[model samples]
Target chain A: HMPVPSFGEAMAYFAMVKRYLTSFPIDDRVQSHILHLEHDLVHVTRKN
Target chain B: PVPSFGEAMAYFAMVKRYLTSFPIDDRVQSHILHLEHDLVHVTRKN
Candidate 1:
């Protein structure tokens, strides 16, 4: 079986997502999606 | 855009080191990125 995941693995995952999407030829709607996505992500990223 | 600066480098620094040394490209990353859309949730976040 595979190893268990904690926080940093997930942290790096979304970081890569944001980075990958930044390269796409997307428009405002997509940007808006990324907006909320990032916001929601950081809400889960902290020490709390 | 001004650029992401620290966080971008922090994540991608490892990505760059991993991918560049092996000669991978956008499509490779893009393939990994594909799972972002589904509820299966490989990446992105809550």
Candidate 2:
């Protein structure tokens, strides 16, 4: 119960994940995932 | 585009004439018209 993610924690987690993945070697799968992640981030940010 | 405020007013008057026939209530009609006017103003400014 104490481990539940807060909104800020979730955002920090997303940023960390994004930074790590963006630093990784780009393969086709990684590239596709990045594109979709970017789209989702932009849509969510804009809606807020 | 219409030449001046008078023309814009005339255009809006024409719109109001047509808008009056719709089944929407007065508040919704006014809101829609307000949005329409805002859009038009932005268009004209741009």
Candidate 3:
């Protein structure tokens, strides 16, 4: 069975997502989705 | 080579490290976002 990922591991992936999406070329709508996702990630990061 | 969960995460870290070294294009961005979506669920249970 796969080991459960910790909060730290999850946050690591989120950080990568932030860096990966920054300045990436995509449709404006796609950009909006990414920004929203970032907001959600930030909320969780801060709450933890 | 196939990797286990933690190993996959490590691989992802390495991939992101190098991927960010250059400008990301649309195709790569898609993959990254897909990873993000799955991660959202993976972390949701924690």
Candidate 4:
């Protein structure tokens, strides 16, 4: 069985992922919420 | 489990942080005041 991640571990992973993606300079015209919504959609689809 | 008085104070601090962000609404202010009053009663009773 996979070990459960602690809150710190989860937060660290999230921060690492965020920093990695944001490291590349992208067009600022697109809102961050659009990407957030896309992430939510993936979670919804994965759960179903 | 019930929160201790110290935990309640911490909880109030957390609530206050969130509440401060929004413009003051009378109804919301009243609700917060009521909760604060209840917390005071809890401390007084205990």
Candidate 5:
């Protein structure tokens, strides 16, 4: 019971969240989260 | 610094829906890997 968002949309949203957070003193724990999400964004963007 | 377990799980779960909506593929591994890292920090009792 939901509508799926485009990969680009979700991808960008996560990127925006990561970017905004990285602008401050983020937890070291967040590094992996950002890395993984960055990978997600990378893979999705390359999808045709 | 402390971590936000709830926020980590919540966002992962939220986006997980988006992830599951698609068929399994190479990218799925990274998603799980990301979730694994998130959970590791979130559940750490230190």
Candidate 6:
């Protein structure tokens, strides 16, 4: 099986990504994609 | 680049970890993953 992130650890990872999104050197397109993912994640979290 | 290699690596690590760990929609996910792959390729050449 693929390595799966534990729920708690995943939240930590998610938080770290949120904090670094704007500061990272990667292209703005990549940042936007991640932002989309984050919003999707928020919906998932909200419904749970 | 505004970020030092160390800072970039740190950000890359976190983004990669989070991307892999979550179930993101492939349309958005693929774009970031593709960009990330290229970023790693170019960044490591320095």
lDDT of 4 by residue, B1-46 (tens): 3455565545454444444344645655655555455455534644
How far residue A17's Cα lies from its native spot in candidate 3, in Å, is 16
How closely does chain A match the true chain A in each prediction, as TM-score? 0.57, 0.49, 0.47, 0.45, 0.56, 0.51
In model 6, what lDDT does residue A33 have?
Answer: 61
TM-score of 6: 0.42
Could you give candidate 5's per-residue lDDT for residues A1-48 as a string of tens digits? Answer: 334557766664455445444545657666766776667655655773
- In model 3 chain A, which range of ten residues has the least summed lDDT? A18-27
Estimate how well candidate 5 is docked, as a DockQ score: 0.22
Worst 10 residues of 1 chain B by lDDT: B37-46
Quality of candidate 1 docking, DockQ: 0.05
* lDDT score for residue B3 of model 4: 53
* Candidate 3, residue A3: lDDT: 33
Per-candidate iRMS values, in order, are 11.6, 23.7, 12.9, 18.5, 5.0, 5.4
lDDT of 2 by residue, A1-48 (tens): 123343344344444444443443445654454444444434444554
lDDT of 1 by residue, A1-48 (tens): 223334466456556656655655555655655555444434433523
Model 2, total clashes: 0
* Model 6 C-alpha lDDT per residue in residues A1-48, reported as the tens digit of each score: 323455455556555554444454656666666666656555545654
For candidate 2, lDDT tens digit of each residue in B1-46?
2234444444334433333334546554544444344434444554
Could you give candidate 6's per-residue lDDT for residues B1-46 as a string of tens digits? 2565555556556645655555656775665565456456546543
Ranking of candidates on lDDT, top first: 5, 6, 3, 1, 4, 2
Docking class of 3: incorrect
Candidate 4, overall lDDT? 0.43
Over A1-48, each residue of candidate 4 has an lDDT whose tens digit, in order, gives 223343344334334333333334433322253244234323433443
Could you tell me the TM-score of candidate 5? Answer: 0.47
Model 1, CA-based lDDT: 0.44
Score candidate 2 by TM-score against the native.
0.32
